[PDB]
Symmetry: D2
Subunit: 122 residues, 4 copies
């Protein structure tokens, strides 16, 4: 799945996800969000199962983006957890956690949860 994961992905929000999969299980690339306190590209890093089950199952993976680059700092970090599914319509189905740096008093409202679906098209 190293070949299938590597490339440019887009989600339902119009965000752009460019990633290279290493043979070891490494994930490296850049993320560009279409929404939120974000501008241009952001460094991402993550991991994936380099030897997934051969019974029609998807490939587990995850990656992190800290929302600080040369243009902005949203003092937050998102992690995507999900699986890559190959085939004619390859997808990456994820759920995500967005944690914002806060004081201890505001910790209870520091984390957003959501889900993205990434496709190779559009």
């Amino acid at each position: 799945d190293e070949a299938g994961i590597t490339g440019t992905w887009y989600n339902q929000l119009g965000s752009t996800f460019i990633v290279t999969a290493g043979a070891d299980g490494a994930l490296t690339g850049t993320y560009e969000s279409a929404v939120g306190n974000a501008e241009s590209r952001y460094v991402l890093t993550g991991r994936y199962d380099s030897a997934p089950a051969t019974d029609g199952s998807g490939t587990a993976l995850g990656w992190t983006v800290a929302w600080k680059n040369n243009y902005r700092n949203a003092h937050s970090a998102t992690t995507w957890s999900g699986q890559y599914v190959g085939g004619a319509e390859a997808r990456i189905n994820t759920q995500w956690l967005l944690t914002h740096g806060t004081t201890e008093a505001n910790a209870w409202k520091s984390t957003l949860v959501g889900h993205d679906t990434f496709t190779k098209v559009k």
Copy 2:
């Protein structure tokens, strides 16, 4: 917070989290889970806000572990999203998503959610 994040962390389950923070916002190290289908150390990678807010707020961060090493493969990947809080009792408060590689029929039950608290002690 580069100095404060770098080092060995332990959670409420007795898991061991060893990480090096780069000046750029990079996170690299190894994870050892005390529970689940896991044995010995696993490669982790992640990101953190290298220039957090200076108003008593915590530092946002996240990291990924794919549960495959030389000993086992749980065909799953966990991402931790949360914040680092410094001070006399430094903590890393996280919430996590554990996605298991599954078929499309079993996708609905592929992801576990939970929370860990990491301390420098014990």
Copy 3:
């Protein structure tokens, strides 16, 4: 939105969600899951904002199902949290938490997280 919420809903899994909305904000009805350790109808209860914002926003709501009826007991309970969106294609977009009764040793893996979208059609 009392009229719009009341009725039969279906999700992406083919589950059936029948609910009555009270003028007070009450939600009552039955749930039938197409997947998992579940059979026939299950009692649901929940709440919704009976006076939502009039600026094109959705109506916040939530409901609980304990997976015990006269046929089975999965020793688990799901809560859906999300919003109702009206219009020609009325939807209920949710995220859910499925907690399974476990021992303290297995608490870390007791909770599933996911998302459902409910429509009036199909």
Copy 4:
């Protein structure tokens, strides 16, 4: 566990959770949050497994609060999903989803995720 669940609970934020458990699996009561856009008591409803496993496991449960009462309307709703654990130090361990009514453009940032622990004391 009907007797054990029924009563007044408090969480780590100092919120107050008063609930009556029905023999059928029903949960009814009021919630008072110590934080957020909330004031005084709010109606809650939920479900619990009335016949849990007798192997030292906890009792699965869930409840919903829509944050509208006679004093305020935060146009949001929280659902708690978790388990009740009996014994000398009875607890209710939960994870929660807080959905805010939003426009379709802001849907991605509509839901907060967190966790509360409820005890009978303090």
